[PDB]
Amino acid sequence: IIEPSLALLAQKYNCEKKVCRKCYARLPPRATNCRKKKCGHSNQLRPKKKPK
Amino acid sequence: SKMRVTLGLPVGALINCCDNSGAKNLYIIAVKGWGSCLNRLPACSLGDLVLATVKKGKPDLRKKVHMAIIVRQRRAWRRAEGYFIYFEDNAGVVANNKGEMKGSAVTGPVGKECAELWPKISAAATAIC
Amino acid sequence: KSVYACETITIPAGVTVDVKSRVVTVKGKYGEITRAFRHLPVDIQKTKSGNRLKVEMWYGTCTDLSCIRTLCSHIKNMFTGVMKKFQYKMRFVYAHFPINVNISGNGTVVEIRNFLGEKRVRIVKMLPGVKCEKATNVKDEIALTGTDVELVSRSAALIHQSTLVRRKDIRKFLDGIYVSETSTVEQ
RNA sequence: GUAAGCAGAACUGGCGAUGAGGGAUGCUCCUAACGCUUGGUUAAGGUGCCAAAAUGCUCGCUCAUCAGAUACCAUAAAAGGUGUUGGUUCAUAU
RNA sequence: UUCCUAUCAUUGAGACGCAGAAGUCUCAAAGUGUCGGAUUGUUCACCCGCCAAUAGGGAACGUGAGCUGGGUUUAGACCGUCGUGAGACAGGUUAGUUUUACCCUACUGAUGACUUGAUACUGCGACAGUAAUCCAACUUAGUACGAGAGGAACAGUUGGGU
């Protein structure tokens, strides 16, 4: 059982994120730059993929 | 989950063959679950699965790499009751890629630690130890 | 760089505040938190009409100017601590295996059994100034309540960290425990 | 010649034949060329300690979970950064 | 014997065209481990097998007063091609000596003078070196997940390798 109401809450921490292109760091949904030293605070992001 | 037994046969050894598959001989070639020592010949104990060729036997059964299990052993080993068994001769049984024996009947004695592991070789054995 | 900057904080009625040195005791009706601010270069000082607390820095560069409002937000949280408490509701989530959770409610500790069909038991002691009620009548919910924010919200987050999936895709397997709502108890 | 502490030339100056002071250390860089010496003054280069002389004065910038630090010289680039400090030019305080 | 990391495996993560299982990509990682054989003088190579995995390298292309001498590279001899010939060949072939440490240091072990007295016993511990590491079975479970085939993991129990 999923429960549709709880699935919003559960997907918030897991799915609804961004990802650094260069260092793969999991980020907040409205970032501009990555937070990490080693990618150079890079601004090339993407959405974290979600299953259909 | 076999307990350690002294290893009496290195890779090179040529042993006898119990079962009715028609092979007289079994020449050992490798051992299953052998790790990594420099220069150590891999060796097998009582009970355990190996690989082998037949050297003389039925002509379809020659020049292939069969799995066998070892059944008697002339090298001595210590049972925990505090004495040292050793058989008269080294001997084994030709076996399938699972672990089942190929040919059903088994001549000779067998060890305790063959019958303790493999269920099928216990049943067909005449008298264990 | 910048010559002067000063934001001020409104103290509510049923509270008292005693800023000697940098360190700020806040006593209210429910409990009391003390907290030190000997990092920040800043002059805290309350007023003649003593339900207001001004705070100021001279010569603040633009990095260090951003620590004036960080003070206010921490002190404001200490006020709504000692009045109202900080309830953090957390809800359990699972597909197949119902996760079985018990409490030594005074202590307090939270053993978590049968998370994702597992046999390892996962005790989580809370920080000194926070308790854990199992929330009645609503199915599957833990309410964490205490005076401080940072003690409670760690203690909430420690439970989230303990009950985390590994070696499997996190998007399908949503089996966990998560904070639903930040709130207060009293209103 | 891909290039080389590679090969071959032009002008002047050096090293070779040459120490002294500096470049930690270096045949060729810098200052400067040497009889034995007393006093005074500088050069290049330096003044936290090793080390003679500034923890001197005065104004900016920088925080590095591999800071940086002195020509020849003992390597670093394309491309990035909402880390911070200034500038140029548009558009409604951002 | 030690060192390096440009990591094959093992540890903890992150990403996926990640349902599970299996993988591919990336970060912290050199703590531990990287094998048995057939043919060739081989370095390389190519097979048979095992395995958690059979990653790549350096140290005067580590290592001959450490060995070995199969190869290369003396003198004998054979074949082929070249040369009128003596002879030649990064062409093939077989037979052919591997010397000395007792010196200094280094390393490994052994005694040993002396310091607010002699001699005896019990101690303290600056500093240096370090050690454990991988796999399998039983249950967990034919459960999770999946349309089905297939098919995990942690805690617990028991063994095995090095």
Cα B14 from Cα B55, distance rounded (Å): 9
C-alpha angle C166-A33-A6 in degrees, rounded to nearest 5: 40
3-state SS class at B65: coil
Neighbours of C52 (CB within 10 A): 12
3-state SS class at C59: strand
Amino acid (1-letter code) at residue B115: A
Cα C114 from Cα C11, distance rounded (Å): 47
At C157, which helix (H) or strand (E)? Answer: helix C149-162
Cα C156 from Cα C159, distance rounded (Å): 6
Cα C153 from Cα A31, distance rounded (Å): 23
Q: Give the DSSP per-residue string, B79-123.
A: -TTS-EE--SS-EEEEE-SSS-BSSS-B-S-B-HHHHHH-HHHHH
Length of chain B: 129
* Cα dihedral value C17, C19, C25, C29, nearest 10: -10
Question: With contact defined as beta carbons under 8 Å apart, do C35 and C74 qualify?
Answer: yes
3-state SS class at C73: helix
User: Residue B114: is it exposed, middle or buried by C-beta count within 10 angstroms (0-12/13-18/19+)?
Assistant: buried
Cβ neighbours of residue B73 closer than 8 Å, sequence gap 6 or more = B5, B8, B9, B45, B46, B86, B87, B90, B111
Place of tokens 């907290």: C35
C63 DSSP assignment: T
**Chain C nearest CA to A12, separation (Å):** 10
- Contact between chains at C171 and A51 (C-beta distance less than 8 A): yes
Nearest to residue C105, comparing CAs of C68, C81, C131? C131
User: Experimental method used, please?
Assistant: cryo-EM
Question: With contact defined as beta carbons under 8 Å apart, do A51 and C172 qualify?
Answer: yes
Alpha-carbon distances of A7 from A3, C11, C91, C175, rounded to whole Å: 6, 40, 11, 10
- Contact between chains at A10 and C95 (C-beta distance less than 8 A): no
Chain C touches chain A, with at least 3 Cβ pairs below 8 Å, answer yes
Residue A52 contacts C where some CB pair is shorter than 8 Å: no
* Spatial distance from the CA of B4 to the C1' of E120 (Å): 54
- Looking at the DSSP bridge assignments, the partners of residue B25 are B16
Nearest to residue B111, comparing CAs of B61, B68, B82, B77? B77
Question: With contact defined as beta carbons under 8 Å apart, do B23 and B54 qualify?
Answer: yes
Cβ neighbours of residue C149 closer than 8 Å, sequence gap 6 or more = C77, C81, C86
Subunits close to A (at least 3 CB pairs below 8 A): C
Nearest to residue B49, comparing CAs of B110, B112, B14, B101? B101
Residue A8 contacts C where some CB pair is shorter than 8 Å: no
A-chain residues within 8 Å CB-CB of C172?
Answer: 51
Question: With contact defined as beta carbons under 8 Å apart, do A22 and A34 qualify?
Answer: yes
**How many angstroms is the resolution?**
3.2
For C17-42, b/e burial (b = at least 16 CB within 10 A) is bebeebebebebeeeebeeebeeeeb
Chain-centre distance for alpha carbon A7:
16
The nucleotide closest to A49 (CA, C1' atoms): E16
- Contact between chains at A10 and C172 (C-beta distance less than 8 A): no
Cα B123 from Cα C17, distance rounded (Å): 87
Cα C182 from Cα B52, distance rounded (Å): 70
Cβ neighbours of residue C86 closer than 8 Å, sequence gap 6 or more = C80, C145, C146, C147, C148, C149, C152, C153, C182, C183, C184
